[PDB]
Design a binder for this molecule. Sequence first.
Ligand code: APU
Ligand code: APU
Lengths: 523, 523
Amino acid sequence: GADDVVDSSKSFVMENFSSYHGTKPGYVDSIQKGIQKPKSGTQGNYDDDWKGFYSTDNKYDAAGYSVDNENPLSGKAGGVVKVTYPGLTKVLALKVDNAETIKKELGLSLTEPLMEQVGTEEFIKRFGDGASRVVLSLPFAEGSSSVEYINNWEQAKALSVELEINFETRGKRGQDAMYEYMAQACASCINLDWDVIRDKTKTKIESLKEHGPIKNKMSESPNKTVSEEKAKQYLEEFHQTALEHPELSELKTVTGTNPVFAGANYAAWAVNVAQVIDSETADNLEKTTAALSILPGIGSVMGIADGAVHHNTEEIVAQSIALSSLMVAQAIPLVGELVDIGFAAYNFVESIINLFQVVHNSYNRPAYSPGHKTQPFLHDGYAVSWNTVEDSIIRTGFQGESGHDIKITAENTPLPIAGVLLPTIPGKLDVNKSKTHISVNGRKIRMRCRAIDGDVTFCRPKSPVYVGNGVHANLHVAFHRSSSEKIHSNEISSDSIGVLGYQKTVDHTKVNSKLSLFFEIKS
Amino acid sequence: GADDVVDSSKSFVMENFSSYHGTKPGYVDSIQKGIQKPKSGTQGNYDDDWKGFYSTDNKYDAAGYSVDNENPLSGKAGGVVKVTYPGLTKVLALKVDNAETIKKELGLSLTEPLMEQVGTEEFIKRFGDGASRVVLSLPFAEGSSSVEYINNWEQAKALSVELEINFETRGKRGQDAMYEYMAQACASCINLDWDVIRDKTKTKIESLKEHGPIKNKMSESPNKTVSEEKAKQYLEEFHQTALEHPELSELKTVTGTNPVFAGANYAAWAVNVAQVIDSETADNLEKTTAALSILPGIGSVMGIADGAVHHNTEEIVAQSIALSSLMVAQAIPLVGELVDIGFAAYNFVESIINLFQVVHNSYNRPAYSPGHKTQPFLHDGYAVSWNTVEDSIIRTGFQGESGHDIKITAENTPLPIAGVLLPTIPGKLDVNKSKTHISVNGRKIRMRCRAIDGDVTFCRPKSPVYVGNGVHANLHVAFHRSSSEKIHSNEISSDSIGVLGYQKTVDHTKVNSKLSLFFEIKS
Ligand SMILES: Nc1ncnc2c1ncn2[C@@H]1O[C@H](CO)[C@@H](OP(=O)(O)OC[C@H]2O[C@@H](n3ccc(=O)[nH]c3=O)[C@H](O)[C@@H]2OP(=O)(O)O)[C@H]1O
Ligand SMILES: Nc1ncnc2c1ncn2[C@@H]1O[C@H](CO)[C@@H](OP(=O)(O)OC[C@H]2O[C@@H](n3ccc(=O)[nH]c3=O)[C@H](O)[C@@H]2OP(=O)(O)O)[C@H]1O
């Protein structure tokens, strides 16, 4: 019944219960006059059972609901307000978001929209625990630790509303105020001054234009349609010359080694832009942002590769954007259609500043790296992951066994799995070699394991293991503990299980493809 | 308690309960004399609680335990025997394989090895349901529908043993008898006559050697160490000439279009072999098989690409193996160390016949294709999967809602998600656009969906979505049903959800990267 849908351990009564609501440009002031079910719109939900007023415990999450709905990609963001219930409010945490289940389990009317019934006396009598009203709590989203609050429309009229932030009052370009506010969430942390980046970029685009060898490199330009193949060629040379400009120097240093950052990738990027921008698009930021957002390769100009944001100083990001701008201007005539001159310096910049902000925001948010929890590790054609979050945890402090499943497959042709590297601590974490195995399309293959140093055993499949399109494996590791003593950090040298892929005489030193699954020791 | 570890719905009592045991060369006859705990070895398990006699309900699975333990990769397989318990036997299906949990829950002694206690009168009294003995049942492996039977050593003495198959009696080369027996499992189905493939290959290797233009192409060969770069070059030309031989004609046709099957990949393969084979390895099949098994690229010679086994006639597989053999012979002198002449024609062939058999066996086994159940779809740098098996099921026949989670990330730099294609049937399967969203590192992004034909709606993220190393997304699709009528096959045009990746003007016709998640309609 009721404990199948309500999680009472995380339900509580609070006095002066507060939360946030993201508000659109046009309502930051009026919503402060009070909360009321609007006359236009879906009123909180497409589904009747879920119609009500929505808030979240996180003001940065509330902020993501503040963008003009007509231009959600590049419009103004309005603000955040904090709404508070006077007195006592019961926050009832639900284990499920299915309204038919909750009405059934909670034994309510199966007919009335659940959210109407939450605002009833009877419902508040039964679940309010003496609070003046009930608000439902659900997890905000996967990968988030916030909660979403679903308020009954009528009970919401009691909310007091105050301004958290009105982003438009900030007076910044684009969605600069919204993103600077969200960057506060992390104080590591990309906290760039976009006003400065915006200003240095302009100065740089201007200066590069005046540059004689640039003004010349441009003179070599076909200045009319040529295949991207020769447009790529003109562009790499152009890039090669612009990057010698004293104002794109630091950028010269930082993009020299990494292949993602190469001149070829800036040219591949510029060619892609010039080819998707027509005059109507070029004329509208929203549509410019809509088109730029679906192209591959933006990481080259962003300085984002391998899990890291390399271009992370206002100076270097401004150089990279200014270099990109100039090169779209060159690409437009050779591979596109429009007023090259215009777009490149204006809506191209406005729009790409916005995509930088979108991507920096994600990297500022807590996330799992490859091979952590259930995030896959993608490498050399293989995809591997802990089947579930508990598999990634090696529990300690007890005598007995555990089992841990790792999914393994590869994208296409049959790639071998040479074996696996596992941590061992005698007594506290032994490998049970009878129970450990690898299953290929259900075929169970036992392993032969051998000691190594670093308290690592190397296990190989008794028979050949290949994975690929249509062939998948489950590596099941069974650990055995003869001691009830807890594993100590000292005792463990590795924080991952290592699956070894195929062998390459990379460096003329035989090396195996390495795929890592990171674990955690607990209890 | 007890219903936390035993699954009584799948436990039963049977008269003349039968099962299979894979037996090693040396024991097919003697084990027929009766089952007895051996004096040497782990007696069924490394863990004491799990020591006992092991059997399986599947004779093809039993067959995978029959290979000489000293040369598990290429040794002889012994056989399968069927063991039967006279009278009544209780098969007790366990929900868990953790012996401490089962002893606790089943309230048994925490001290005695569980499997000793299963063979006790008291234990048989309590769980035998009137059977003369209890056997424990566990799922054989992930991706398998077999079961594993764990028999108490002492109760196992009552088993009657009969010969299923003695593979050695078959008189075949390598592990031909074992693999032909396992191929019976599927009657689609690779059921090759390896005797024929073995014979045609020899004939072909011999004939190619005599071939004048080949004997000549060989005359162009540096016949001494040259970098793989020039060894690759000699090899592609050599391949290009050998494939013109009338005996490798069909092969000429079938490998002409697919890039995996190209002459360059046969040369990349031959170079990899010549470089990992030394004289000692070349002299031992086991070690030859151990080294060949960890190299990438075998799919080129196998004719295996995109989930399919293309070389599936004895004639074409013999041509491909004969061509591969000849080319290792050429590669050895240029990039390796040994008696090129020897290995290539002998242990190289014996060994690669075995890897073909290993890989054909996997493709003969039931498996999930990319994007089915929780198998990921790997494409264009992206990895996507249904988070759990239930997510992949769209249930029908009721009024209400469902939610379905799809994991999304990409291997490195930030790749965009343009939107998603979802099936719609009015009333029976509507998209609830309030509840449907995509979460990027916890950032919840709503969608705007638009109709299409084929009862498909196209939904785009309100804001830009990029995934990559360190940035992952959860696409949560919420479906709503206003009708309690079941979805009919007629009504649904698609069997997958389509995630759309970045855009490419591939064909000079703008195309999006397509990632598919296949669903099933039930109830
Ligand atoms: N005086 C007012 N009293 C009440 N509402 C007012 C008032 N003034 C303006 N509003 C707006 O009215 C709508 C419902 O409250 C909300 O905006 P939306 O643009 O429809 O908001 C878009 C969606 O965001 C949801 N959402 C918004 C912000 C948030 O923090 N959490 C959340 O989930 C909304 O429920 C809405 O859902 P539905 O579109 O599915 O109805 C809200 O901002
Ligand atoms: N007369 C006999 N009575 C009993 N055993 C005899 C007899 N003659 C030979 N044996 C062998 O003795 C061992 C235990 O029964 C088995 O072989 P293994 O090579 O140790 O077998 C290798 C492993 O395969 C397991 N296994 C084998 C076949 C099978 O179908 N299922 C399964 O899980 C075994 O329990 C064994 O585990 P442990 O190594 O972890 O002990 C078995 O084939």
